[PDB]
Write an enzyme that holds these catalytic residues in place. Structure first.
Site, PDB file in Angstrom:
ATOM      1  N   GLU A  35     -10.617  34.745   8.221  1.00 37.82           N
ATOM      2  CA  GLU A  35      -9.560  35.140   7.294  1.00 37.82           C
ATOM      3  C   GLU A  35      -9.068  36.544   7.629  1.00 37.82           C
ATOM      4  OE1 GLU A  35      -7.812  33.753   4.957  1.00 37.82           O
ATOM      5  OE2 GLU A  35      -8.838  31.805   4.889  1.00 37.82           O
ATOM      6  N   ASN A  46       3.488  36.764   2.714  1.00 37.97           N
ATOM      7  CA  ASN A  46       3.823  35.346   2.787  1.00 37.97           C
ATOM      8  C   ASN A  46       5.281  35.094   2.408  1.00 37.97           C
ATOM      9  OD1 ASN A  46       0.671  35.348   1.613  1.00 37.97           O
ATOM     10  ND2 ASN A  46       1.066  33.918   3.293  1.00 37.97           N
ATOM     11  N   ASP A  48       6.537  33.285   0.175  1.00 42.29           N
ATOM     12  CA  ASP A  48       6.782  33.184  -1.262  1.00 42.29           C
ATOM     13  C   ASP A  48       6.742  34.522  -1.992  1.00 42.29           C
ATOM     14  OD1 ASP A  48       4.069  33.731  -1.165  1.00 42.29           O
ATOM     15  OD2 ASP A  48       3.560  32.337  -2.776  1.00 42.29           O
ATOM     16  N   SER A  50       4.271  36.583  -1.976  1.00 45.28           N
ATOM     17  CA  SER A  50       2.899  36.987  -2.256  1.00 45.28           C
ATOM     18  C   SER A  50       2.283  37.648  -1.043  1.00 45.28           C
ATOM     19  CB  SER A  50       2.044  35.787  -2.643  1.00 45.28           C
ATOM     20  OG  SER A  50       1.831  34.950  -1.525  1.00 45.28           O
ATOM     21  N   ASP A  52      -1.693  38.516   0.807  1.00 48.98           N
ATOM     22  CA  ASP A  52      -3.121  38.220   0.855  1.00 48.98           C
ATOM     23  C   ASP A  52      -3.814  39.553   1.109  1.00 48.98           C
ATOM     24  OD1 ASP A  52      -2.702  35.419   0.618  1.00 48.98           O
ATOM     25  OD2 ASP A  52      -2.258  35.312   2.762  1.00 48.98           O
ATOM     26  N   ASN A  59      -5.063  35.960  -2.541  1.00 48.46           N
ATOM     27  CA  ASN A  59      -3.629  35.915  -2.813  1.00 48.46           C
ATOM     28  C   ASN A  59      -3.113  36.475  -4.142  1.00 48.46           C
ATOM     29  OD1 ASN A  59      -1.036  34.123  -3.631  1.00 48.46           O
ATOM     30  ND2 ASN A  59      -1.063  34.518  -1.427  1.00 48.46           N
ATOM     31  N   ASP A 101     -13.098  27.139  -9.098  1.00 40.78           N
ATOM     32  CA  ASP A 101     -11.859  26.514  -9.549  1.00 40.78           C
ATOM     33  C   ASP A 101     -11.707  25.038  -9.181  1.00 40.78           C
ATOM     34  OD1 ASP A 101      -9.324  27.204 -10.979  1.00 40.78           O
ATOM     35  OD2 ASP A 101      -8.410  26.487  -9.108  1.00 40.78           O
TER      36      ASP A 101
END
Length: 129
Positions: A35, A46, A48, A50, A52, A59, A101
């Site tokens: 990562e 990103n 969108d 966002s 990281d 995120n 989650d």
């Protein structure tokens, strides 16, 4: 700062990630490797809007707040800047919420693509743990 493989394995063990939600230590180290390449300062923008953040590339759309991401949920209830620390505490605490989650470690694409199903124990062999 950039963590050494064994140094990170020791810190993650210290923070209770070994077998957390059924995932052995190697999984977590492997995820951090692909990562962020063990880099606590890494960030990636990103499409969108966002970003990281950190060693586990958490995120800003769902987990932390950076104040510039549309549709932010801040489910970890922490500023994203706290995830860019040399201390991995904030990142681990949030990672524990993410993996619980229901998606397991699939939340990390790098883990999904390069760790899942492999000999993840290799990531901790040779280490003094």
């Amino acid at each position: 700062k950039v963590f050494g493989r064994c140094e990170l394995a020791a810190a993650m063990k210290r923070h209770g990630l070994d077998n957390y939600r059924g995932y052995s230590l190697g999984n977590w180290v492997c995820a951090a490797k692909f990562e962020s390449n063990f880099n606590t300062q890494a960030t990636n923008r990103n499409t969108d809007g966002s970003t990281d953040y950190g060693i586990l590339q958490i995120n800003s759309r769902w987990w932390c707040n950076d104040g510039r991401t549309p549709g932010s949920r801040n489910l970890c209830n922490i500023p994203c800047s706290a995830l860019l620390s040399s201390d991995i505490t904030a990142s681990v605490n949030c990672a524990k919420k993410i993996v619980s989650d229901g998606n397991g470690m699939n939340a990390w694409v790098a883990w999904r693509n390069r760790c899942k199903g492999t000999d993840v124990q290799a990531w901790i062999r040779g280490c003094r743990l």
